[PDB]
């Protein structure tokens, strides 16, 4: 069968499986890529937390937290604590356009996890709160 | 017209960007005000043409899977070469695969670009690798 | 056009408002 980039829809009968688990059962790696920090949490399909790592918890401080290599290190740390709990395949949900948006996913792979999907959940208000005024630089 | 100038007297002249025209040109001649515009806009058209070939599987199955993204495409004014830039990947191993297929594809792509009779005369395309800090991965190799 | 006439009116109205403020 040809490859579909569209995820399997829950309730339909798909043939795709990962270690005998359906798409709806794969744990989720939630990456919050901010401009000055990156936070990574791996949770189960039932919303059970399994591992958490951020650049701040990995000994990065101030502007060093807002780097790709800092997020990559946080991903490796979250992968290690998650792999101990039985995680191999993860669904990645990244919100934000920070520097650790892509690098945080690299660290998850180097840590022994297999990414089966990528989801963006960057909050976009449909009209929402007034942002801060423009900067004069 | 708009604030963008369109008063050129020879607006009906046939634009002829070819390698032969450059040799048969007055050395005193200098580029006119709206002469750069045609170059700026012709280079943009080449960017459009190349981008579609990469994402359409009909052109090549190997090229389609690579999912190459063009960072920049700027033709030369000499009409001898064309500069196209594609974004590098993190994995140096993956970088080699993309460059190899692109290097061999370019020759066929040039003929595919000749299919567009409007741009039939396309100088050999130079698929430069840039935008991905190619020299940074090279430094790590050392 | 230049804003030199506006600038004259700009200073006149500023000095006037300040005079009223002081007195």
């Amino acid at each position: 069968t040809k490859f579909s980039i569209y995820p399997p829809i829950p309730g339909e009968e798909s043939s795709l499986r990962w270690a005998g688990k359906k798409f709806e059962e794969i744990p989720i790696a939630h990456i919050k890529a901010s401009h000055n920090n990156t936070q990574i949490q791996v949770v189960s399909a039932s919303n059970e937390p399994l591992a958490f790592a951020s650049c701040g918890t990995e000994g990065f401080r101030n502007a060093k937290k807002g780097t790709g290599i800092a997020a990559q290190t946080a991903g490796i740390a979250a992968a290690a604590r998650a792999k101990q709990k039985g995680v191999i395949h993860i669904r990645v949900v990244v919100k934000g356009l920070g520097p650790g948006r892509l690098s945080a996913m690299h660290g998850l792979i180097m840590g022994g996890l297999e990414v089966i999907s990528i989801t963006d959940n960057t909050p976009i208000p449909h009209x929402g709160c007034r942002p801060r005024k423009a900067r004069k630089l | 017209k708009v604030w963008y100038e369109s008063p050129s007297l020879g607006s009906h002249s046939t634009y002829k960007p070819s390698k032969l025209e450059f040799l048969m040109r007055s050395t005193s001649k200098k580029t006119r005000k709206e002469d750069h515009a045609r170059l700026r806009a012709l280079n943009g058209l080449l960017y459009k043409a190349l981008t579609d070939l990469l994402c359409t599987p009909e052109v090549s199955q190997e090229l389609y899977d690579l999912n190459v993204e063009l960072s920049k495409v700027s033709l030369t004014p000499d009409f001898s070469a064309c500069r196209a830039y594609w974004k590098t990947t993190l994995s140096a191993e993956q970088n080699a695969h993309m460059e190899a297929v692109l290097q061999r594809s370019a020759a066929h792509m040039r003929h595919l670009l000749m299919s567009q009779q409007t741009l039939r005369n396309v100088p050999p395309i130079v698929f430069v690798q840039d935008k991905g800090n190619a020299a940074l991965a090279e430094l790590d190799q050392l | 056009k230049n804003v030199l006439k506006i600038r004259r009116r700009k200073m006149n109205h500023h000095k006037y408002r300040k005079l009223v403020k002081k007195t």
Binding site: - | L9, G10, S13 | -
Partner: protein, 74 residues
């Protein structure tokens, strides 16, 4: 330029003159300088094409009127 060769031959055969090339500035209005004080200018100019290659009137149309030369033109 599709007909430059044809027109030059027609002129030579009839014993007349042809100018199908890039018309230089002042050939008519500055002829004495370009050719000499005793140069005789044309008594009649026949245009087989009145427009130049940029789709503007051939400069010789205006310059023929300036020099009071009658013009025949398609």
């Amino acid at each position: 330029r599709q007909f430059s060769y044809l027109i030059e031959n027609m002129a030579r055969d009839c014993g007349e003159y042809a100018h199908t090339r890039y018309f230089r500035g002042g050939m008519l209005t500055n002829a004495r300088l370009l050719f000499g004080p005793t140069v005789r200018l044309p008594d009649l100019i026949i245009f087989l094409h009145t427009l130049n290659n940029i789709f503007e009137p051939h400069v010789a149309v205006r310059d023929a009127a300036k020099m009071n030369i009658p013009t025949v033109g398609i």
